[PDB]
Amino acid sequence: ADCEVCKEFLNRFYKSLIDRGVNFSLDTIEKELISFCLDTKGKENRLCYYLGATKDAATKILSEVTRPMSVHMPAMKICEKLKKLDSQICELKYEKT
């Protein structure tokens, strides 16, 4: 399960957009993703940074995430795209605790 944290989070995000009847336009996807990333902690907050969706993150990367989302690119494929930048995105694991 390469990219598993990333894949599940993006699928959760997709499902939220669908369930809330949100338009898949670029600006909307961008704001919604930044919003979805707001209350995140730990590994999910690190993922949000790798997605371009935290204050200290790269909007260049945010564009690389939200443009594929506008055509409903499968989450695994978005994650695999980002892995080529910084591979740690696909290596994340939640605390074993």
From Swiss-Prot:
Location within or outside the cell: Secreted
Tissue/organ expression: Widely expressed in neuronal and non-neuronal tissues. In the brain, highest levels in the optic nerve and corpus callosum.
Induction record: Not induced by endoplasmic reticulum stress.
Molecular-function GO term, any one: growth factor activity
Top-rank taxon, per record: Eukaryota
Entry keywords, A to Z: Disulfide bond, Growth factor, Secreted, Signal
Disulfide bonds: C3-C90, C6-C79, C37-C48
GO CC field: endoplasmic reticulum; extracellular space
Function according to Swiss-Prot or TrEMBL: Trophic factor for dopamine neurons. Prevents the 6-hydroxydopamine (6-OHDA)-induced degeneration of dopaminergic neurons. When administered after 6-OHDA-lesioning, restores the dopaminergic function and prevents the degeneration of dopaminergic neurons in substantia nigra.
Family: Belongs to the ARMET family.
Annotated protein name in UniProt: Cerebral dopamine neurotrophic factor
Full protein stretch here: 35 to 131 of 187
